[PDB]
Structures are given as structure tokens and as C-alpha cells.
Amino acid sequence: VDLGTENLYFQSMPARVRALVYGHHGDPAKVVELKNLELAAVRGSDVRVKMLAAPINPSDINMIQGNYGLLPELPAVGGNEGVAQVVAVGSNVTGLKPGDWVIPANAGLGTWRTEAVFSEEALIQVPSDIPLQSAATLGVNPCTAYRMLMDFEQLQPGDSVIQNASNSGVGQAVIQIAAALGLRTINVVRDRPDIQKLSDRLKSLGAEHVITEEELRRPEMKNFFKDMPQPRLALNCVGGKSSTELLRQLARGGTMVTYGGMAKQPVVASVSLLIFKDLKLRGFWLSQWKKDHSPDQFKELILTLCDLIRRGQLTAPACSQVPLQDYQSALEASMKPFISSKQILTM
Amino acid sequence: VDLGTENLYFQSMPARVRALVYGHHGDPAKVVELKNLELAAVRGSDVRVKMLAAPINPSDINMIQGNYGLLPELPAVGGNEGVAQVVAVGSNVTGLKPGDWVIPANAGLGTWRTEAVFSEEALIQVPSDIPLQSAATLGVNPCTAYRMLMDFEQLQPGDSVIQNASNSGVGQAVIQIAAALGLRTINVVRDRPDIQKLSDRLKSLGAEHVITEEELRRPEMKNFFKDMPQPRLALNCVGGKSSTELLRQLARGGTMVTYGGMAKQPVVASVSLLIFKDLKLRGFWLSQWKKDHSPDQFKELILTLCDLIRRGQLTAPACSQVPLQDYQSALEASMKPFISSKQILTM
């Protein structure tokens, strides 16, 4: 599989099954091993799929480390996100057919492998006319972005939204989806030499303002809201003082939604802000959303996002294609504090 | 005025007007002075009241210090809570009459004085058949307790609620009101030599469990919820690690409401708790509630609480009566970390 192909057809002739498996929780670099697996049987309502591409995401890493809200039984296959082609279907399957592309209906499936047999209900069909890189990353980051923009505060064109980790996959999707919604984004990024290039890139995605964490926390920020309404929504993935400074920007009655961060960097909320500004703090967990909603509700979200991708309104972040056998370097790269390219395992 | 009288009638013959006034924000002990004021005129819709008793509350102190969400213009009279008797009414007043008891309709009025002229709309009539100590403290602490129990989570008999600062005025009211609602309270208190006496007293108010902050944070707390459902509501006034440990006790989807605390002790929320447990953090500001609702809505709350007081189901905490002239000692006593008696200024 060549991740960047414009020829979205692939051969699926028989080959050995290989998977990235971990038998203990721990450092992904140490616990994840490439293994051969036996050919599994396709029961009545099962389908056999051939994995095309699967990103390495923070949640994949946290799961392997054992610091996540869902922990598949061990030994487990790594990876929660990816796109696969249906290659065979059980005798009772009528809703998927060979050649269909599918992504997992929820977390926990184990996507870092060449092929697998899954229950039909564990999968969602996705359109096969979108770039592979987009299909591979469709089910997590832009879904999280869309849900947080829709589910917490009622926003209309010209309203503002503030976020941190703006250059992350979710942050870049927030920028693009907010732009399509007519929202005005204030996008906080970590301080970095050569901030200009990053700012230009995020503005090319539709970002209205791009400011560093240092700019966020300095007195001049108090004057930021001439020509710009205060946001009623703040999206956080950083915690600590950064999360407190995001809170400080919210309009009275606003909500800050936390969708990621580190253990030992909790979110910090001043008493004055909670009480006198009546701010709200919430979390968002996409996997719980998927559990709580129908497969059809997830599919509807997917289709909405695909409409955006076809129009060039939702483009994937920079990616590096890595053959499954070269996973070790990809895992190492994915655990750095500054990742320049999303690592995407191909087979 | 003798605060503990069972004879709830008082003389209101003319006397000089004396008030506790501050001209700068700062240490209440330093900025608050006893002053004589001129006799004010009663306009058409004004009423003249004689103050009977007024507590000293944390919010009064924070206002004087300048660290509060509402700051009356200076020079200002101290105090936001109290009960007064109407002594005279303007020609257009028909809803209050001489002899009625009233409390402020909202914060900011300046209650630490012997008498005042206020707009009729700035006051709420309260029943005059309840003890003076109860009338003096009715408008803030039990109102805050009731509102937080009613406004955030739908609770039914047998559901649990957890709180800290359980021996405070609000905490004691939460215990009593929760008891009357058929709720099961878990009441966290600060560690103190001779904890037994405090625990007995809070249980005499209807508290189900009384545990110290140390007991809250120790591993054994993980086993606390056999025979007891996890609370969907937590009430916080402490912040810091204490607030994090309260959060840890909430059922998935629960809410922690913060209604007080210190500057420099912010509320701290772990990412895991926000995301995987879908917890909510909120604030509650009674003065904002009063601003947002009608005087009639506040009066309805008052009447509900008075029904409880008459039945012995809402008793006032221990109080010390302090003549207005002796305010300095009362202010000093009210600013200690462990206050044994609520200080109530009388005139």
C-alpha cells in the first residue's frame, strides 16, 4: 500500500497475518512486538478485512501504557484507528461486501495488523472515494473536533472559539471545521523558534488568530477582545497554567472542554472564575460518545465529514507512511513532544 | 437587642445613626471604622428600617478586602446580610408597613449599621415569628445550601451527596436540608484534635457519615461505597487536593459545585476524571441567582426555609451576639481559620 496513491484500488491476495502485539502494559517501544498470527475463521456474521493504513495516535500509546479509560484484555493488538478493505463475508452478512472500505465502530479493535476477522457490528462502512490518508484518520480526530464544537455550546457564525494544542490533529480539524461553520478561532500554540511558518500554515487552514502560550498569558491579552467577541467555548488538551489562561478568556457562562492531556498536569480552575464568571469545565471522550450512540449516528457524522473532505475543506495533516515492519521508528517518532508528521502504518 | 430573646418585639425610638464604614479596600480590621451618619430622607417608594442583627460572613470580608465579584462604591457600609424592622414608609409604599421584618433582596446593601433608608424593591419581607438568629442568617447560608442541592443534579431520597467544609454555615445547612430531602450525606471536615465531639454534633443535625480530610484521601476510601451509593453531587468550598479527592468520589457524570474558597487555592481536576468519568465542575454564586430571579422567587425560597425552621428541621449554628460598638473583636474572631461561633452584630 502506497499511502499517497490517487489509484484507490489495492490487491488483496493471500499473505501471512502479521500484527503488532503487546502482552504487558508499558513503554510501547519495549512491549510491542511484531508477531505472526494464525488464519482465523469467518463465522456467519463476521467479515475478513485487509488493513490498508492505521495511524499511531496518543490514545493508542496511552492504552499500551495502561493509562487509559478502556484497556483491552492482554495479549492485545495495538491501535484503535484505521481503514481496511472487506475481503470476505460470512454467510449471514448482507450489509458489507468485498471491496467495501470500513473503519472500527469504536475503540479497542486492534488495527496495527495486516488483516483480521471482525464482527460486522464492530465496523462502519466509509466511502472509498476519499484519499487513503483521510480515510485512515477520519474516525478519531475530526470526529472529536466536530463533536466538541456541536455538543457543548450553541455557536452561530461570527461567534469565537479558543483552543490550545492548535497544531495537533484535533486542533487542525477544529480550525477547518470551525472555519466551515463560520466561527472565529483563536488558536494557542506552544512557543517554538520559527513560529512564523507554523502561523502561516494554520492561517492557510482558515485560522483567524494564532498566538503562543506566552502571548496568551501576558497582560496585553486583556485587550485582545476589541473587534473580537469573547469565546463561549474553549477546547483544552494541555492542562496546568495553560488551561487556567484559556479559562480566563471565556465569556461569563462559557465552557472549557478537556479532551486530552498528561497525568500530573491536571486542569486548574480558579475559584473566582468558577463562582463569579459561572464557567463550566467538562471532558469529552469520543469512544464514550460512540458507545452511547448508534452506528448510524456515527456513520452520519462520517458522511458529513466526507462531504467536507471532497470539497477540500478538511485536509489531512502532514503524514509519513511507515511499513508495518518499520513500526519501531514510527512509535519512537510518535512519542516525541514535537511530532512534525503523523505516523501512519501501512501494509 | 438581645439576640436570644423569645420576645420578638423591639423598641424603635429615635437614636443616632451609627454604621461600620470602609473608605478603602483592605484588611477589615484596619479599614472599617464606626461612624455617625446623618438622618436620611424617606422618598415616595423608600422605607426606613432599624437593623436588628447582622452576621459577619466570609463574603462580607472578601468584599472589604476587594476580592469579590461585587464591590460597592466607596466609602461603603460593611455587611450584606441581616434582618431589620420597618419603622417608616414613604407615601407610595403599600407592600411593607411599620413593624414588618425585612432582609436585603440582594448583596451590596450595607447591613452593619443601626438604621438606614432603602428602596422598597431592595428588601424582602420575612416572617417575624422565627428566632432572631434564624432571621439574621436566613438569606445567605441556607439559601445557598438549598439552591446547590436543587439546581445541579436531580436527586431523590436515598441518593448521596458529598461535601467538604461540613461544619461551616453552608455545610451545616446542607446537612439539615439534605436530611429533610431524604438524601444521604457524606460530610468531610478538616482534621482537628477532639474530632469526636464535632462528629456527634453534625450527626445530631442528621449527618449520615462524618470523615476527615485525611480519611477522605487514604486508600481505604476506595472501599467506602459498600451499603452506600456513589454521590452524583459534590459540594466544594476548599479547593486544592481536598477538591481533587472530592471529585474522585463522584459517580460517572457527577457534578462538583464550588461555592467558596481561597485565592491561590484553585480547584484541581485530573484529566482522567474529566474525560473518562465525564465529571462536571461548576460554580454557584447566590447573589447572581438573586439578580437573575424575581424577588417573589427569593421570597418563595425564604418561606420554604421558614417552614423548616418552625419545625425544628433547620436550626442556626452556634452564634455570639456582639454589640455594634464591639465590632473590632468580632471581625478579628471572624477571620480565624477555626471560628467556633458565628459573630452576629446586634444593635
PDB file of C-alpha atoms in Angstrom, chain B residues 13-21 34-40 48-51 77 112-117 324 347:
ATOM      1  CA  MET B  13     -37.391  55.087  69.439  1.00  0.00           C
ATOM      2  CA  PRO B  14     -35.134  57.681  67.705  1.00  0.00           C
ATOM      3  CA  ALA B  15     -31.375  57.251  68.230  1.00  0.00           C
ATOM      4  CA  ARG B  16     -28.236  58.393  66.442  1.00  0.00           C
ATOM      5  CA  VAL B  17     -27.318  56.528  63.246  1.00  0.00           C
ATOM      6  CA  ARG B  18     -24.043  54.581  63.545  1.00  0.00           C
ATOM      7  CA  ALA B  19     -22.502  52.478  60.795  1.00  0.00           C
ATOM      8  CA  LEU B  20     -19.377  50.415  60.093  1.00  0.00           C
ATOM      9  CA  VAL B  21     -17.868  52.143  57.063  1.00  0.00           C
ATOM     10  CA  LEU B  34     -17.526  53.101  63.312  1.00  0.00           C
ATOM     11  CA  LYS B  35     -19.018  56.390  62.114  1.00  0.00           C
ATOM     12  CA  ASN B  36     -22.021  58.579  62.766  1.00  0.00           C
ATOM     13  CA  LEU B  37     -24.250  59.192  59.733  1.00  0.00           C
ATOM     14  CA  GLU B  38     -26.825  61.909  59.023  1.00  0.00           C
ATOM     15  CA  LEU B  39     -30.551  61.167  59.148  1.00  0.00           C
ATOM     16  CA  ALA B  40     -31.614  60.376  55.566  1.00  0.00           C
ATOM     17  CA  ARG B  48     -36.745  53.446  56.854  1.00  0.00           C
ATOM     18  CA  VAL B  49     -35.556  50.346  58.675  1.00  0.00           C
ATOM     19  CA  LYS B  50     -33.958  49.705  62.043  1.00  0.00           C
ATOM     20  CA  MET B  51     -31.328  46.913  61.819  1.00  0.00           C
ATOM     21  CA  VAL B  77     -21.095  50.374  54.724  1.00  0.00           C
ATOM     22  CA  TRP B 112     -23.659  46.775  59.589  1.00  0.00           C
ATOM     23  CA  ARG B 113     -25.497  49.881  60.827  1.00  0.00           C
ATOM     24  CA  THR B 114     -28.238  50.838  63.232  1.00  0.00           C
ATOM     25  CA  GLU B 115     -30.723  52.109  60.665  1.00  0.00           C
ATOM     26  CA  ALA B 116     -30.993  53.068  57.002  1.00  0.00           C
ATOM     27  CA  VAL B 117     -33.376  54.220  54.297  1.00  0.00           C
ATOM     28  CA  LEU B 324     -22.033  47.125  67.083  1.00  0.00           C
ATOM     29  CA  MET B 347     -27.956  46.994  67.884  1.00  0.00           C
TER      30      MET B 347
END
